[PDB]
UniProtKB/Swiss-Prot annotation, chain A:
Included stretch of the parent chain: 1136 to 1184 of 1282
Subcellular location: Nucleus, Nucleolus
Organism: Homo sapiens (Human)
Pathological condition linked to this protein in its record: Aplasia cutis congenita, non-syndromic: A disorder characterized by congenital absence of a portion of skin in a localized or widespread area of the body. The lesions are most commonly localized on the scalp, however aplasia cutis congenita can affect any part of the body.
Disulfide bonding pattern of the chain: none
Main function: GTPase required for the synthesis of 40S ribosomal subunits and for processing of pre-ribosomal RNA (pre-rRNA) at sites A0, A1, and A2. Controls access of pre-rRNA intermediates to RCL1 during ribosome biogenesis by binding RCL1 in a GTP-dependent manner, and delivering it to pre-ribosomes. GTP-binding and/or GTP hydrolysis may induce conformational rearrangements within the BMS1-RCL1 complex allowing the interaction of RCL1 with its RNA substrate. Required for RCL1 import into the nucleus.
Subunit structure: Part of the small subunit (SSU) processome, composed of more than 70 proteins and the RNA chaperone small nucleolar RNA (snoRNA) U3. Interacts with RCL1.
Full protein name: Ribosome biogenesis protein BMS1 homolog
Family recorded in the similarity comment: Belongs to the TRAFAC class translation factor GTPase superfamily. Bms1-like GTPase family. BMS1 subfamily.
Curated annotation (Swiss-Prot), chain B:
Name listed for the protein in its UniProt record: Something about silencing protein 10
Role according to the record: Essential for gene silencing: has a role in the structure of silenced chromatin. Plays a role in the developing brain. Part of the small subunit (SSU) processome, first precursor of the small eukaryotic ribosomal subunit. During the assembly of the SSU processome in the nucleolus, many ribosome biogenesis factors, an RNA chaperone and ribosomal proteins associate with the nascent pre-rRNA and work in concert to generate RNA folding, modifications, rearrangements and cleavage as well as targeted degradation of pre-ribosomal RNA by the RNA exosome.
Organism expressing this protein natively: Homo sapiens
Skewed-composition ranges (Basic residues): 1-23
Superkingdom of origin organism: Eukaryota
Swiss-Prot record, chain C:
Shown residues within the full chain: 1 to 102 of 253
Record PTM Phosphothreonine, positions in chain: T90
UniProt superkingdom: Eukaryota
Compartments in which it is found: Nucleus, Nucleolus
Gene that specifies this protein: UTP11
The protein's name: Probable U3 small nucleolar RNA-associated protein 11
Subunit-structure text: Part of the small subunit (SSU) processome, composed of more than 70 proteins and the RNA chaperone small nucleolar RNA (snoRNA) U3.
Chain positions covered by the region annotation Disordered: 1-26
Summary of the function given for this chain in its UniProt record: Part of the small subunit (SSU) processome, first precursor of the small eukaryotic ribosomal subunit. During the assembly of the SSU processome in the nucleolus, many ribosome biogenesis factors, an RNA chaperone and ribosomal proteins associate with the nascent pre-rRNA and work in concert to generate RNA folding, modifications, rearrangements and cleavage as well as targeted degradation of pre-ribosomal RNA by the RNA exosome. Involved in nucleolar processing of pre-18S ribosomal RNA.
UniProtKB/Swiss-Prot annotation, chain D:
Identification of the protein by name: Deoxynucleotidyltransferase terminal-interacting protein 2
Function: Regulates the transcriptional activity of DNTT and ESR1. May function as a chromatin remodeling protein. Part of the small subunit (SSU) processome, first precursor of the small eukaryotic ribosomal subunit. During the assembly of the SSU processome in the nucleolus, many ribosome biogenesis factors, an RNA chaperone and ribosomal proteins associate with the nascent pre-rRNA and work in concert to generate RNA folding, modifications, rearrangements and cleavage as well as targeted degradation of pre-ribosomal RNA by the RNA exosome.
Subcellular location: Nucleus; Nucleus, Nucleolus
Organism: Homo sapiens (Human)
Cross-link Glycyl lysine isopeptide (Lys-Gly) (interchain with G-Cter in SUMO2) mapped to chain: K19, K28, K56, K101
Tissue distribution of the protein: Widely expressed with higher levels in testis.
Length: 49, 53, 102, 114
RNA sequence: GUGUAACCCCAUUCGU
RNA sequence: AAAAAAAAAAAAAAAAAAAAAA
């Protein structure tokens, strides 16, 4: 490479770079309307309007 | 670099040993300024006397 | 001198580095690794275990069960909503609030 | 029953009959401020609070001037205020520090929220 | 079926 | 722990208030 004019070219993909990840959030659990009716009174989820 | 000289290693261990002691027991200080408060709270619930029986 | 062998080997502390997403697929998002997928995998497992716990409870549900909360509360589409209590103002106080407002 | 009610209105004979003051939004604002005195100054640390709730018997006042302490310990009459809350509003040192911390918490929360 | 409706119905035109 | 409801505040946070799992 020194005798000729060839120069090293490094692939941009292969190099190592900082990732900089961000916190990931998830949906809350959705219970079907049919299941809430089917559930017993003790285990029925009770909320406010 | 601290491990290179044993004397300054022992010097540094003593400085920490005084700091770690400050949690257990209080250091004596003189009234170098007029008393202006405790600089912290005054806890009236702790009873730190030693019972004799 | 087993520990002496270990100390010499760990003299170099350069740790293996992570690879990033290829450029031509950058708009898709971050290349997920085992540490990231494990967050998504444990999230699913918790919800599916909870629904299976709930669906089992519906099996032994007794339709004739009775509780004294049931008398004053009515289901709405199957959901047990606790309706807000009424204030029950009377005309004299209702006239009083308007005089205060003006 | 009625004699119990009369005895609970005062601290008692042991403390020369302190009376429980009526609770107001200005006194309550003062008590909340004192309970959170730990975060006022980053270079000052305090012991834990004695009680979780507010004290039942307490009185409020100001410290009397002493002639010998003209320069050592005395606030000029313009800087004096009526309440502990207004004192916190006045000094630049506390406002500058508190604003910087509160801005940080919102910004870090914004990174978490997005 | 929570992982960051056609079919049918009325009416219009065409035409072995 | 968590899904809610009621207030204030800052450019979301904060105090109380219920249900459900454990």
């Amino acid at each position: 490479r020194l005798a000729h004019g060839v120069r090293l070219k490094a692939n941009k993909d292969s190099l190592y770079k900082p990732i900089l990840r961000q916190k990931k959030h998830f949906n809350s659990l959705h219970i079907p309307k049919a299941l809430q009716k089917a559930l017993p009174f003790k285990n029925k989820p009770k909320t406010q309007a | 670099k601290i491990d290179r000289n044993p004397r300054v290693k022992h010097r540094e261990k003593f400085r920490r040993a005084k700091i770690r002691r400050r949690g257990q027991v209080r250091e004596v200080r003189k009234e170098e300024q007029r008393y202006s408060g405790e600089l912290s709270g005054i806890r009236a619930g702790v009873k730190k006397s030693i019972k004799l029986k | 001198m087993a520990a002496a062998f270990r100390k010499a080997a760990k003299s170099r502390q350069r740790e293996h580095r992570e690879r990033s997403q290829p450029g031509f697929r950058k708009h898709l998002g971050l290349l997920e690794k085992k540490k990231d997928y494990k967050l998504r995998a444990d999230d699913y497992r918790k919800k599916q275990e909870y629904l299976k716990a709930l669906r089992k409870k519906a099996l032994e549900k007794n339709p004739d069960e009775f509780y004294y909360k049931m008398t004053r509360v009515k289901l709405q589409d199957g959901v047990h909503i606790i309706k807000e209590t009424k204030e029950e103002v009377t005309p004299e106080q209702l006239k009083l609030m308007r005089t205060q407002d003006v | 029953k009625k004699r119990r009610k009369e005895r609970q209105k005062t601290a008692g004979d042991g403390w020369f009959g302190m009376k429980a003051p009526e609770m107001t939004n200005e006194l309550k604002n003062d008590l909340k401020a004192l309970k959170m005195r730990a975060s006022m100054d980053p270079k000052r640390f305090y012991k834990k609070n004695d009680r979780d709730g507010f004290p039942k018997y307490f009185q409020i006042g100001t410290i009397v001037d002493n002639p010998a302490d003209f320069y050592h310990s005395r606030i000029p009459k313009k800087q004096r205020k009526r309440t502990i809350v207004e004192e916190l509003l006045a000094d630049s040192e506390f406002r500058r520090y508190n604003r910087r911390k509160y801005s940080e918490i919102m910004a870090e929360k914004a990174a978490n929220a997005a």
